[PDB]
Amino acid sequence: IEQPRWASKDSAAGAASTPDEKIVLEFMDALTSNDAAKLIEYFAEDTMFQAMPLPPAYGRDAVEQTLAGLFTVMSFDAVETFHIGSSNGLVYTERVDVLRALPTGKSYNVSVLGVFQLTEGKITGWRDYFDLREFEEAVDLPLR
Amino acid sequence: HHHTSKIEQPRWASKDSAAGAASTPDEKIVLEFMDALTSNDAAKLIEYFAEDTMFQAMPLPPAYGRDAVEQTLAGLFTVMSFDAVETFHIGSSNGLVYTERVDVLRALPTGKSYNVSVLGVFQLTEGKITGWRDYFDLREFEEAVDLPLRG
Numbered sequence: 102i103e104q105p106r107w108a109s110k111d112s113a114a115g116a117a118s119t120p121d122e123k124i125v126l127e128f129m130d131a132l133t134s135n136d137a138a139k140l141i142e143y144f145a146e147d148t149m150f151q152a153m154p155l156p157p158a159y160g161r162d163a164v165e166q167t168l169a170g171l172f173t174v175m176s177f178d179a180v181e182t183f184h185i186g187s188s189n190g191l192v193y194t195e196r197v198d199v200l201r202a203l204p205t206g207k208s209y210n211v212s213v214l215g216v217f218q219l220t221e222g223k224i225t226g227w228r229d230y231f232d233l234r235e236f237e238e239a240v241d242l243p244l245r
Numbered sequence: 246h247h248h249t250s251k252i253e254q255p256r257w258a259s260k261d262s263a264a265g266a267a268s269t270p271d272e273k274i275v276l277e278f279m280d281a282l283t284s285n286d287a288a289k290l291i292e293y294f295a296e297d298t299m300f301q302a303m304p305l306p307p308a309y310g311r312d313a314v315e316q317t318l319a320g321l322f323t324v325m326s327f328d329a330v331e332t333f334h335i336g337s338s339n340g341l342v343y344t345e346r347v348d349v350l351r352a353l354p355t356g357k358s359y360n361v362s363v364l365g366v367f368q369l370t371e372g373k374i375t376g377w378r379d380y381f382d383l384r385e386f387e388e389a390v391d392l393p394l395r396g
C-alpha cells in the first residue's frame with residue numbers, strides 16, 4: 102500500500118476523532134476476518150450495503166448473505182485509511198482495500214472512498230465507491 | 246435522445262434536512278463549485294483551485310498542479326457535458342469536504358446521458374481547492390453513453 106502522493110501528511114489524517122469514526126475504523130479492521138456472521142453484529146436491523154458498481158442489499162439478512170457471498174470468492178487482506186471525516190451521522194473514509202481473489206489467487210489494491218450511516222452506534226448504511234473494471238482485470242475475475 | 250431531469254432520492258439517502266446542506270464555509274464553497282460544474286468551463290472552474298492542487302477522477306490518471314487540472318478538465322469538456330448535479334450528503338472535517346452526488350453526464354459525440362453515482366473528496370486551504378478526487382465506476386458510464394475514455 103503506497104501512500105498516495107495526495108494523502109495528508111498530518112499524523113491524525115486517518116485516525117478517529119469521534120465515537121462513530123472509531124466504530125468504523127474498528128469495523129474496517131474487522132473486515133480482514135472475512136467472517137460475515139461476525140461483521141453483521143456491527144449492523145442495525147434496518148440497514149443496507151452496496152459496492153456501488155454492483156446492486157445494493159437492503160436488510161440485515163441481505164447484507165450478511167451478500168458479505169458471505171463476497172467472502173466465498175474474495176479475501177479482505179489489509180486496509181489503510183488516509184482520510185476519515187464525518188457529519189450529520191455519516192462517516193467518510195478515503196482508504197485502500199487490499200483484495201485477493203480466491204479462484205485465481207491474484208491481488209489488487211483498490212482505491213476506495215466509502216460512506217457509513219450510523220444510528221445508536223450501529224451501521225444503518227454502507228456504500229463503497231471505486232472502479233470495478235480495473236480490479237476485475239488485475240485478478241482475472243469478473244464480478245458482474 | 247431522451248433523458249429525464251428529475252433525480253430520484255435514493256432509498257438510502259438521509260432525510261435529515263441538514264445532511265445535504267452546507268454548515269461551514271468550506272462546505273458552501275464546494276456546493277458553489279458543484280453548481281459551477283454545469284458550465285463545462287475549465288477557465289471558470291480553475292478559479293476555485295489553488296496553485297498547489299490536484300484533481301483525479303479515480304478511474305483515470307491524475308493531474309497535479311493548477312495548470313494540469315485546467316487542461317484535464319477542459320479536455321473532459323470537449324467530449325462530455327456536465328448537465329446536472331444533486332448532492333444528497335455533504336460532510337466536513339479537518340479541511341476535507343465529502344459529497345455524495347449523482348453526476349448527470351452526457352457524451353457529446355453521441356448525445357446519450359447517464360446518472361453517475363459519485364462519492365467525492367475535496368481538500369481546501371484558505372478556501373481554495375488543493376485537491377479533488379471523485380470515486381465511481383467508469384465502465385458503467387462508458388457503456389451507457391457509448392463514449393470510450395479508457396482502452
